Amino acid sequence: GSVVIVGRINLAYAQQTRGEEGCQETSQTGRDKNQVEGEVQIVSTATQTFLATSINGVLWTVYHGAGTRTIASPKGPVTQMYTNVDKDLVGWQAPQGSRSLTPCTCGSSDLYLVTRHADVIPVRRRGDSRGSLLSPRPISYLKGSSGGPLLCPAGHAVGIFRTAVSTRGVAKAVDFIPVESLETTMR
Ligand SMILES: CCc1nc2ccc(OC)cc2nc1O[C@@H]1C[C@@H](C(=O)N[C@]2(C(=O)NS(=O)(=O)C3CC3)C[C@H]2CC)N(C(=O)[C@@H](NC(=O)OC(C)(C)C)C(C)(C)C)C1
Ligand SMILES: [Zn+2]
Numbered sequence: 001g002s003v004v005i006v007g008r009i010n011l012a013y014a015q016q017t018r019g020e021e022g023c024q025e026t027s028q029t030g031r032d033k034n035q036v037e038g039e040v041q042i043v044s045t046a047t048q049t050f051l052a053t054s055i056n057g058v059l060w061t062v063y064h065g066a067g068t069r070t071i072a073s074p075k076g077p078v079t080q081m082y083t084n085v086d087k088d089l090v091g092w093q094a095p096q097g098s099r100s101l102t103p104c105t106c107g108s109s110d111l112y113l114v115t116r117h118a119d120v121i122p123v124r125r126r127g128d129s130r131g132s133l134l135s136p137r138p139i140s141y142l143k144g145s146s147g148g149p150l151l152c153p154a155g156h157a158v159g160i161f162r163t164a165v166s167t168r169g170v171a172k173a174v175d176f177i178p179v180e181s182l183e184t185t186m187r
Pocket of ligand 2: 103156
């Protein structure tokens with residue numbers, strides 16, 4: 001079926017636009033004539049819910065979430081533009097009404113992760129695709145936030161939340177797809 005937009009996060013505050021009946025319906029129809037807004041979208045399949053983030057006019061998220069699914073749009077289902085499984089990466093054309101995040105070039109190592117509750121979580125950049133959490137978190141607290149953005153102090157995109165780095169059920173750090181690798185994927 002289709003990936004369906006069921007909410008959005010404005011930059012922070014989250015909003016929901018669609019429920020289980022609507023989501024079950026639109027996952028199946030692929031037709032979503034709903035207004036789109038925001039930089040991060042809350043997105044659902046029939047089984048999973050996570051985040052997706054618009055960068056370079058492309059809406060990016062994780063493959064472990066999206067698979068090869070099409071996305072629901074006002075004119076019908078839209079196929080993926082990018083599918084790079086070894087990056088756990090998929091991308092569709094950013095739907096009308098989304099605004100893309102601007103890539104970070106300030107080189108800051110003080111990052112801020114946005115969760116599906118529109119909570120903003122401090123990260124210390126530890127390297128290209130790695131960030132350590134200042135306060136470690138339970139895995140289930142961060143479940144549903146993959147595909148969501150890591151920002152710099154200025155509000156620029158540093159990457160897309162992919163995997164959590166866990167010891168004994170506690171996330172001590174985050175793995176993210178950097179904005180440069182999206183560039184690489186696009187070319
Ligand atoms: C290798 C990644 C992967 N690839 C897949 C490819 C195909 C596939 O087929 C189905 C499944 C895959 N699963 C995958 O991983 C799965 C999915 C993914 C996941 O849950 N991602 C997030 C998250 O919030 N995810 S999410 O809940 O939003 C999900 C709905 C999208 C961001 C996490 C929130 C806590 N996973 C990890 O993050 C694991 N961490 C981890 O693997 O770290 C390593 C890479 C350093 C070892 C956990 C569970 C320990 C936290 C395991
Ligand atoms: Zn920046």
